[model samples]
Target chain A: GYTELEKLHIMRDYLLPKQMEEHGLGRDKLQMNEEAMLKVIRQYTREAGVRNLNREAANICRKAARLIVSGEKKRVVVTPKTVESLLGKPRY
Target chain B: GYTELEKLHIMRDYLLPKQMEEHGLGRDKLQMNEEAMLKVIRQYTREAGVRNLNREAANICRKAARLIVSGEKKRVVVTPKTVESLLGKPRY
Candidate 1:
């Protein structure tokens, strides 16, 4: 699997762009950056109970994209605080 | 990211058991093995248009569980032929 740091870059470089297209949102409209991405990783790692941070990070990104596309929200902002409301409290 | 083979192990070892619980199905009921798991990986790698085989395998396993849980099917089988029906034709 990917190293934790490489996983973060995959979220930023690959998954983020794909999600933007999948949700039909402009890149500028989505409020995601490296910091917000990390929070999503942290939240999903606990939920999935997987120590592999990269895998969890990818899962969280996809989950956020689905929520955004389904109209759960207009724009997805993945911050440490915001992730709790979206994905529940972080476990680890 | 993980090597193609390592990714297969994750799907077999980690993702499979977790998905069994997530879908509330007995491990015995899920018809997945290392060979079948590879097919799922192939299907998802094409669907996601990502070259990372391991990541796609993980995604397919989760998708299968969700489908099974949502009553789309009783048991999730991950074989080369079955994966085409579940995830569409393999691209690469």
Candidate 2:
């Protein structure tokens, strides 16, 4: 029900904030580029109420947490390229 | 021949510089963390005079070039974690 693009907005505006904090990541520590956000929404998911979108975004938070908790990176800027690196080949 | 440690110095002192420039990357565009350099030497390569080391280093350059030239990242930092991401699990 008109969930795809809507999910994208929710993800960037709040889901990322919530996921990042839940995963022990701060707001400034993680950033999803505009292109990367759209790519994730359009290519990686299709579901009602953005459920799949939530799952996909959480996946990003998980990996980014690993990168930070392991002391590997100070900041993670998730661009389109990084989306592929983190999530693997796109599903769609 | 004292290869392993000497090879590390050569790679950082020269190979990385030359490779970065050749790959259309500037001097400050790429950086290899200390632990990652050691990991690449100890875990990724086993050889005489560091031939394998050179190959492994070049491999990183190749991948970094893709990241930079593709307009994905402006600066690339190679930590042990990133090394694994770019080059995959270590051989040794």
lDDT of 1 by residue, A1-92 (tens): 55556667877787666644443345544567687667666545543323445444444545554443233664567666666654575665
For all predictions, the C-alpha RMSD in Å is 10.6, 12.1
List candidate 2 stretches off by more than 4 Å: B1-92
Give the lDDT of residue B51 in candidate 1: 41
Worst 10 residues of 2 chain A by lDDT: A63-72
Q: What is the TM-score of chain B in candidate 2?
A: 0.86
Instruction: For residues B10-81, write the lDDT of model 1, one tens digit per residue.
Output: 767776666444433455445776777776665456433324544454445455544542345745666666
Docking quality of model 2: it rates as incorrect
Model 1 DockQ class: incorrect
Interface RMSD of 1: 9.1
